Design a protein around this ligand. Structure first.
Ligand SMILES: [Zn+2]
Ligand SMILES: [Zn+2]
Ligand SMILES: [Zn+2]
Length: 279
DNA sequence: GCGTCC
DNA sequence: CGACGA
DNA sequence: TCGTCGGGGACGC
Protein backbone atom coordinates (compact mmCIF):
# COMPACT_ATOMS: atom_id res chain seq x y z
CA UNK A 1 0.00 0.00 0.00
CA UNK A 2 1.09 3.59 -0.53
CA UNK A 3 1.11 6.33 2.09
CA UNK A 4 0.25 9.62 0.43
CA UNK A 5 0.25 13.07 1.99
CA UNK A 6 1.75 16.53 2.18
CA UNK A 7 4.02 18.63 4.30
CA UNK A 8 1.34 20.20 6.53
CA UNK A 9 1.66 23.16 8.88
CA UNK A 10 2.47 22.62 12.55
CA UNK A 11 1.38 26.12 13.44
CA UNK A 12 -0.20 26.19 16.85
CA UNK A 13 1.17 22.78 17.84
CA UNK A 14 2.58 19.55 16.37
CA UNK A 15 -0.75 17.82 16.93
CA UNK A 16 -2.26 20.31 14.48
CA UNK A 17 -0.14 18.76 11.75
CA UNK A 18 -1.79 15.39 12.28
CA UNK A 19 -5.20 17.09 12.38
CA UNK A 20 -4.53 19.01 9.13
CA UNK A 21 -3.29 15.85 7.48
CA UNK A 22 -6.52 14.05 8.34
CA UNK A 23 -8.54 16.97 6.99
CA UNK A 24 -7.07 16.52 3.50
CA UNK A 25 -7.51 12.75 3.80
CA UNK A 26 -3.78 12.13 3.73
CA UNK A 27 -2.37 8.72 4.58
CA UNK A 28 1.08 10.17 5.33
CA UNK A 29 2.40 13.56 6.41
CA UNK A 30 5.54 15.57 6.99
CA UNK A 31 6.13 18.40 9.42
CA UNK A 32 8.79 20.54 11.08
CA UNK A 33 9.01 19.77 14.82
CA UNK A 34 10.18 23.36 15.32
CA UNK A 35 10.62 26.43 13.15
CA UNK A 36 13.09 25.58 10.35
CA UNK A 37 14.52 29.10 9.98
CA UNK A 38 15.68 29.51 13.63
CA UNK A 39 18.45 27.84 15.60
CA UNK A 40 16.76 27.58 18.99
CA UNK A 41 13.40 26.40 20.26
CA UNK A 42 11.96 25.52 23.65
CA UNK A 43 12.21 21.87 24.64
CA UNK A 44 9.17 19.71 23.90
CA UNK A 45 6.68 19.83 26.77
CA UNK A 46 5.03 16.58 27.91
CA UNK A 47 1.69 18.07 26.81
CA UNK A 48 2.95 18.82 23.29
CA UNK A 49 4.28 15.28 23.02
CA UNK A 50 1.15 13.66 24.38
CA UNK A 51 -1.12 15.83 22.23
CA UNK A 52 0.88 14.86 19.14
CA UNK A 53 0.88 11.15 19.90
CA UNK A 54 -2.84 11.25 20.70
CA UNK A 55 -3.59 12.95 17.41
CA UNK A 56 -1.58 10.42 15.42
CA UNK A 57 -3.42 7.57 17.14
CA UNK A 58 -6.77 9.22 16.52
CA UNK A 59 -6.11 9.61 12.82
CA UNK A 60 -4.16 6.37 12.21
CA UNK A 61 -0.71 7.77 11.45
CA UNK A 62 1.99 5.35 12.56
CA UNK A 63 5.65 6.40 12.62
CA UNK A 64 6.16 4.62 9.24
CA UNK A 65 3.84 7.20 7.73
CA UNK A 66 5.43 10.37 9.11
CA UNK A 67 8.48 12.11 7.63
CA UNK A 68 9.69 15.01 9.81
CA UNK A 69 12.10 17.44 8.22
CA UNK A 70 15.03 19.18 9.91
CA UNK A 71 15.95 22.81 9.96
CA UNK A 72 17.15 24.72 6.88
CA UNK A 73 20.07 26.15 8.90
CA UNK A 74 21.93 22.91 9.52
CA UNK A 75 24.90 22.21 7.30
CA UNK A 76 26.33 18.81 8.13
CA UNK A 77 29.29 19.21 5.80
CA UNK A 78 30.29 22.72 6.92
CA UNK A 79 33.92 23.48 6.11
CA UNK A 80 34.32 25.59 9.26
CA UNK A 81 34.76 23.64 12.49
CA UNK A 82 32.64 25.85 14.75
CA UNK A 83 29.73 26.02 12.27
CA UNK A 84 29.95 22.28 11.65
CA UNK A 85 29.80 21.71 15.43
CA UNK A 86 26.76 23.91 15.90
CA UNK A 87 24.98 22.11 13.03
CA UNK A 88 25.95 18.74 14.42
CA UNK A 89 24.55 19.82 17.79
CA UNK A 90 21.35 21.06 16.18
CA UNK A 91 20.98 17.87 14.19
CA UNK A 92 21.33 15.66 17.27
CA UNK A 93 18.65 17.78 18.99
CA UNK A 94 16.39 17.27 16.01
CA UNK A 95 16.89 13.50 16.18
CA UNK A 96 16.17 13.57 19.87
CA UNK A 97 12.92 15.43 19.39
CA UNK A 98 11.97 12.62 17.01
CA UNK A 99 12.76 10.07 19.71
CA UNK A 100 10.55 12.00 22.09
CA UNK A 101 7.68 12.19 19.61
CA UNK A 102 7.85 8.49 18.74
CA UNK A 103 8.98 9.34 15.20
CA UNK A 104 11.35 6.96 13.43
CA UNK A 105 12.43 8.89 10.32
CA UNK A 106 14.16 12.24 10.02
CA UNK A 107 14.54 13.79 6.58
CA UNK A 108 17.46 16.22 6.15
CA UNK A 109 19.58 17.90 3.43
CA UNK A 110 23.14 16.65 2.95
CA UNK A 111 25.21 19.86 3.39
CA UNK A 112 27.24 22.43 1.37
CA UNK A 113 30.98 23.05 0.86
CA UNK A 114 30.71 26.85 0.34
CA UNK A 115 33.70 26.44 -2.01
CA UNK A 116 36.02 26.18 1.01
CA UNK A 117 36.54 22.39 1.03
CA UNK A 118 36.44 19.62 -1.58
CA UNK A 119 33.32 17.62 -2.40
CA UNK A 120 35.04 14.47 -1.10
CA UNK A 121 35.82 16.09 2.22
CA UNK A 122 32.32 17.55 2.57
CA UNK A 123 30.67 14.17 1.87
CA UNK A 124 32.85 12.59 4.51
CA UNK A 125 31.93 15.32 7.00
CA UNK A 126 28.27 14.62 6.33
CA UNK A 127 28.78 10.88 6.86
CA UNK A 128 30.54 11.65 10.15
CA UNK A 129 27.79 14.02 11.25
CA UNK A 130 25.35 11.17 10.67
CA UNK A 131 27.48 8.71 12.65
CA UNK A 132 27.68 11.20 15.54
CA UNK A 133 23.91 11.56 15.62
CA UNK A 134 23.16 7.83 15.40
CA UNK A 135 25.63 7.43 18.25
CA UNK A 136 23.56 9.61 20.61
CA UNK A 137 20.09 8.38 19.75
CA UNK A 138 18.12 5.22 19.02
CA UNK A 139 15.31 4.17 16.72
CA UNK A 140 15.50 7.15 14.34
CA UNK A 141 16.76 6.67 10.75
CA UNK A 142 18.66 9.45 9.05
CA UNK A 143 16.95 9.98 5.68
CA UNK A 144 19.10 11.93 3.25
CA UNK A 145 17.19 13.99 0.70
CA UNK A 146 18.59 14.46 -2.83
CA UNK A 147 19.04 18.10 -3.81
CA UNK A 148 18.76 20.28 -6.87
CA UNK A 149 22.40 21.28 -6.63
CA UNK A 150 21.90 25.00 -5.98
CA UNK A 151 25.09 26.85 -5.02
CA UNK A 152 27.57 24.63 -3.21
CA UNK A 153 24.89 22.23 -2.01
CA UNK A 154 25.82 18.57 -2.45
CA UNK A 155 23.43 15.63 -2.84
CA UNK A 156 22.39 16.43 -6.40
CA UNK A 157 24.02 13.28 -7.80
CA UNK A 158 22.83 9.88 -6.58
CA UNK A 159 26.56 9.08 -6.26
CA UNK A 160 26.78 11.67 -3.49
CA UNK A 161 24.05 9.88 -1.57
CA UNK A 162 25.84 6.56 -2.08
CA UNK A 163 29.16 8.01 -0.90
CA UNK A 164 27.57 9.38 2.28
CA UNK A 165 25.95 6.01 2.99
CA UNK A 166 29.26 4.25 2.39
CA UNK A 167 30.59 6.39 5.26
CA UNK A 168 27.80 5.52 7.68
CA UNK A 169 28.64 2.89 10.28
CA UNK A 170 25.12 1.74 11.12
CA UNK A 171 23.49 1.28 7.72
CA UNK A 172 20.33 0.02 9.44
CA UNK A 173 19.54 3.66 10.31
CA UNK A 174 20.38 5.57 7.15
CA UNK A 175 18.21 6.00 4.09
CA UNK A 176 17.23 8.37 1.30
CA UNK A 177 14.25 10.48 0.27
CA UNK A 178 13.98 11.26 -3.42
CA UNK A 179 12.47 14.62 -4.36
CA UNK A 180 11.32 14.60 -7.99
CA UNK A 181 11.74 18.34 -8.51
CA UNK A 182 15.23 18.19 -7.19
CA UNK A 183 16.12 15.17 -9.34
CA UNK A 184 14.76 16.88 -12.44
CA UNK A 185 16.59 20.10 -11.61
CA UNK A 186 19.83 18.12 -11.16
CA UNK A 187 19.53 16.53 -14.64
CA UNK A 188 17.55 13.31 -14.00
CA UNK A 189 14.71 13.36 -16.54
CA UNK A 190 11.20 12.34 -15.54
CA UNK A 191 9.10 13.79 -18.40
CA UNK A 192 8.06 10.42 -19.84
CA UNK A 193 7.61 6.90 -18.39
CA UNK A 194 10.74 5.81 -20.30
CA UNK A 195 12.73 8.59 -18.74
CA UNK A 196 11.35 7.60 -15.34
CA UNK A 197 12.56 4.06 -15.97
CA UNK A 198 16.01 5.34 -16.86
CA UNK A 199 16.23 7.63 -13.85
CA UNK A 200 15.16 5.01 -11.30
CA UNK A 201 17.43 2.34 -12.86
CA UNK A 202 20.27 4.82 -12.22
CA UNK A 203 19.06 5.23 -8.63
CA UNK A 204 18.90 1.43 -8.31
CA UNK A 205 22.49 1.02 -9.57
CA UNK A 206 23.99 3.78 -7.51
CA UNK A 207 22.03 3.79 -4.23
CA UNK A 208 19.53 0.94 -4.43
CA UNK A 209 15.87 0.79 -3.47
CA UNK A 210 16.62 -0.89 -0.16
CA UNK A 211 17.62 2.52 1.16
CA UNK A 212 14.52 4.31 -0.17
CA UNK A 213 12.59 5.62 2.83
CA UNK A 214 10.44 8.45 1.42
CA UNK A 215 9.60 10.55 -1.62
CA UNK A 216 8.79 14.19 -2.10
CA UNK A 217 6.30 14.45 -4.98
CA UNK A 218 6.91 17.85 -6.49
CA UNK A 219 6.52 19.15 -10.02
CA UNK A 220 9.21 21.67 -11.06
CA UNK A 221 8.88 25.40 -11.87
CA UNK A 222 12.57 25.27 -12.72
CA UNK A 223 13.72 23.57 -15.94
CA UNK A 224 15.64 20.37 -16.69
CA UNK A 225 19.18 20.37 -15.32
CA UNK A 226 18.83 23.99 -14.22
CA UNK A 227 20.06 23.13 -10.74
CA UNK A 228 17.36 25.46 -9.35
CA UNK A 229 15.06 24.36 -6.54
CA UNK A 230 11.56 25.70 -7.30
CA UNK A 231 8.51 23.51 -6.81
CA UNK A 232 5.23 23.46 -8.63
CA UNK A 233 1.82 21.77 -8.35
CA UNK A 234 1.47 18.36 -10.00
CA UNK A 235 1.09 18.63 -13.75
CA UNK A 236 1.69 22.40 -13.82
CA UNK A 237 5.49 22.42 -13.99
CA UNK A 238 8.16 21.16 -16.39
CA UNK A 239 7.92 17.52 -15.30
CA UNK A 240 4.21 17.07 -16.03
CA UNK A 241 1.78 14.51 -14.64
CA UNK A 242 3.11 11.32 -16.25
CA UNK A 243 5.96 10.84 -13.78
CA UNK A 244 3.54 10.92 -10.87
CA UNK A 245 1.14 8.41 -12.42
CA UNK A 246 4.19 6.23 -13.13
CA UNK A 247 5.32 6.38 -9.51
CA UNK A 248 1.82 5.60 -8.20
CA UNK A 249 1.68 2.55 -10.42
CA UNK A 250 5.09 1.18 -9.35
CA UNK A 251 5.10 -1.06 -6.29
CA UNK A 252 8.66 -0.10 -5.38
CA UNK A 253 7.25 3.04 -3.83
CA UNK A 254 4.94 1.36 -1.30
CA UNK A 255 5.18 1.49 2.50
CA UNK A 256 7.02 4.81 2.61
CA UNK A 257 5.79 8.40 3.10
CA UNK A 258 5.07 10.00 -0.29
CA UNK A 259 4.92 13.68 0.48
CA UNK A 260 3.64 16.58 -1.60
CA UNK A 261 5.60 19.81 -1.16
CA UNK A 262 3.73 21.48 -3.98
CA UNK A 263 3.24 25.21 -3.83
CA UNK A 264 -0.57 25.63 -3.52
CA UNK A 265 -1.76 23.99 -0.30
CA UNK A 266 -5.37 24.82 -1.26
CA UNK A 267 -5.34 21.93 -3.70
CA UNK A 268 -3.45 19.28 -1.63
CA UNK A 269 -6.61 17.30 -0.95
CA UNK A 270 -7.26 17.15 -4.70
CA UNK A 271 -3.60 16.29 -5.46
CA UNK A 272 -3.76 13.53 -2.87
CA UNK A 273 -6.94 12.13 -4.39
CA UNK A 274 -5.60 12.34 -7.90
CA UNK A 275 -2.47 10.44 -6.79
CA UNK A 276 -4.63 7.79 -5.07
CA UNK A 277 -6.69 7.37 -8.20
CA UNK A 278 -3.59 6.78 -10.39
CA UNK A 279 -2.85 3.49 -8.59
C1' DG B 1 20.78 45.63 -2.07
C1' DC B 2 15.55 43.65 -2.80
C1' DG B 3 11.54 40.09 -2.40
C1' DT B 4 11.09 35.51 -2.58
C1' DC B 5 11.94 30.61 -2.30
C1' DC B 6 13.56 26.12 -0.06
C1' DC C 1 7.53 28.70 7.85
C1' DG C 2 5.99 29.05 13.08
C1' DA C 3 5.73 32.24 17.05
C1' DC C 4 4.26 36.45 18.34
C1' DG C 5 2.52 40.73 18.82
C1' DA C 6 -1.93 44.40 19.59
C1' DT D 1 -6.10 37.98 9.57
C1' DC D 2 -2.21 40.97 9.09
C1' DG D 3 3.01 42.31 9.05
C1' DT D 4 7.38 40.93 11.30
C1' DC D 5 11.59 38.08 12.88
C1' DG D 6 14.68 34.79 12.16
C1' DG D 7 19.49 34.91 9.96
C1' DG D 8 21.47 29.68 6.29
C1' DG D 9 21.99 29.60 1.52
C1' DA D 10 20.27 30.67 -2.76
C1' DC D 11 17.84 32.66 -7.07
C1' DG D 12 16.61 36.35 -10.32
C1' DC D 13 16.49 40.85 -10.31
ZN1 LIG E 1 14.02 19.00 2.15
ZN1 LIG F 1 12.01 18.19 -0.94
ZN1 LIG G 1 12.96 21.74 -2.79
Amino acid sequence: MKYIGAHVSAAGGLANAAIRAAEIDATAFALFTKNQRQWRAAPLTTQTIDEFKAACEKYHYTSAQILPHDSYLINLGHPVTEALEKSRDAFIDEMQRCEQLGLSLLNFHPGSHLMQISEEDCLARIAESINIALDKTQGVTAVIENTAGQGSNLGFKFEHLAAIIDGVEDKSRVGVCIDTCHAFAAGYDLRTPAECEKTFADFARTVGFKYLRGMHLNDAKSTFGSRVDRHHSLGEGNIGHDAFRWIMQDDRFDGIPLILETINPDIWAEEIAWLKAQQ
